């Protein structure tokens, strides 16, 4: 289930507004559980630091 995806760091995945799913690699994360909280959840065009480390 896609909803099953929860912030890997927390696991509550209840913050609908802050839970961002990384398509590159990371599964689910919160804007605050990542790096300095982002202004908002990107419109589907973003990646987490784990995928960036690849490059």
């Amino acid at each position: 289930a896609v909803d099953l995806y929860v912030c890997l760091l927390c696991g509550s995945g209840n913050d609908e507004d802050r839970l961002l799913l990384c398509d590159g690699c990371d599964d689910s994360y919160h804007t605050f559980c990542l790096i300095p909280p982002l202004h908002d959840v990107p419109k589907g065009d973003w990646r987490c630091p784990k995928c960036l480390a690849q490059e």
Partner: peptide
């Protein structure tokens, strides 16, 4: 990024 939500009923 895609938004995801999670809630439980009880």
């Amino acid at each position: 990024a895609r938004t995801k939500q999670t809630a439980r009923k009880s």
